[PDB]
Amino acid sequence: DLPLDPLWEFPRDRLVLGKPLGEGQVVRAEAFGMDPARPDQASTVAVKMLKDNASDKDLADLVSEMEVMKLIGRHKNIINLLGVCTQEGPLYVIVECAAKGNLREFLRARRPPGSSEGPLSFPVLVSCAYQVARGMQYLESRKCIHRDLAARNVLVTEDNVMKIADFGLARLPVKWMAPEALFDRVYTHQSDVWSFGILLWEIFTLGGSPYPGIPVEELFSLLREGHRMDRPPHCPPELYGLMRECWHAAPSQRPTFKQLVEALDKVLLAV
Numbered sequence: 001d002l003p004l005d006p007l008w009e010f011p012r013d014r015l016v017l018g019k020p021l022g023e024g025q026v027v028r029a030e031a032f033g034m035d036p037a038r039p040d041q042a043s044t045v046a047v048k049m050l051k052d053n054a055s056d057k058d059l060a061d062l063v064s065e066m067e068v069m070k071l072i073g074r075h076k077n078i079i080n081l082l083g084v085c086t087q088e089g090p091l092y093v094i095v096e097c098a099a100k101g102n103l104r105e106f107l108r109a110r111r112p113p114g115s116s117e118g119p120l121s122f123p124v125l126v127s128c129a130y131q132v133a134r135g136m137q138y139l140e141s142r143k144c145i146h147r148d149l150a151a152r153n154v155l156v157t158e159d160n161v162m163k164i165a166d167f168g169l170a171r172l173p174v175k176w177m178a179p180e181a182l183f184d185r186v187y188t189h190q191s192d193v194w195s196f197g198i199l200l201w202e203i204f205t206l207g208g209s210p211y212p213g214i215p216v217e218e219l220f221s222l223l224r225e226g227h228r229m230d231r232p233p234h235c236p237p238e239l240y241g242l243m244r245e246c247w248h249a250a251p252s253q254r255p256t257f258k259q260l261v262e263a264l265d266k267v268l269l270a271v
């Protein structure tokens, strides 16, 4: 069926499938020789594959995600393609495996009891936001609109590096969506900037649920009449200011990812 790409093909005999991560399905694996320098050395990776019940369209979608990830290329702050198995057996798409799970769960697990101080300092929270902005800036430079940026879709490595997940998926989390996406089904880089603002609020609530209480029904009317989430407790005004800029009704009045990187850089340099 599928052509052999010599830049990406990985020997499936050097890939040891382990415990499922989610169910098409994603399984944890040991890969031998992901570093050509030390070809004996093992590394933990994630493998995406189809289930037997999968249609021709399911396969086309996984081929599309593989091909878009090859073209976008690699960055520190995205979940990178590592290799593929396309020959004499099922399609495997091999990617980086982030040890510490998604950013939502990482933050929620590090909530202190009541009003005590948590292990997560202001500079570490701002660093999380900065790394996600750097990842989105890169994806934007590779003509990639995410469409579903949220803390659940950012993963965390052993060394607390943020990696944007699921940026290559083939075409409802309404609480993350820009009004033009809600009402007009239009997704742009500036729609992603709105979602980044919601993610910033998730970071400074240590994984809070957005618009808490307000049912999806009343959200659309709230946004139309100029209302937005309130400054979360202990969130400095500079960072609430950035959230509110991301939530301007006019896409052109929202900051660019370049301006978000620069703004978050300025906060980190000031500490």
Ligand SMILES: *CCC(=O)Nc1cccc(C)c1Nc1ncc(OCc2c(Cl)c(OC)cc(OC)c2Cl)cn1
Pocket (backbone or CB within 6 Å): 021, 026, 028, 044, 045, 046, 047, 048, 065, 066, 079, 080, 093, 095, 096, 097, 098, 099, 100, 101, 102, 155, 164, 165, 166, 167, 168
């Ligand atoms: C790595 C060790 C481990 O088990 N990590 C773990 C444990 C619980 C939850 C999570 C989210 C993780 N990390 C983790 N899970 C999945 C993952 O890759 C998924 C994936 C796939 Cl398979 C993909 O295929 C094309 C594309 C992706 O985004 C570009 C992603 Cl995120 C990575 N890390």
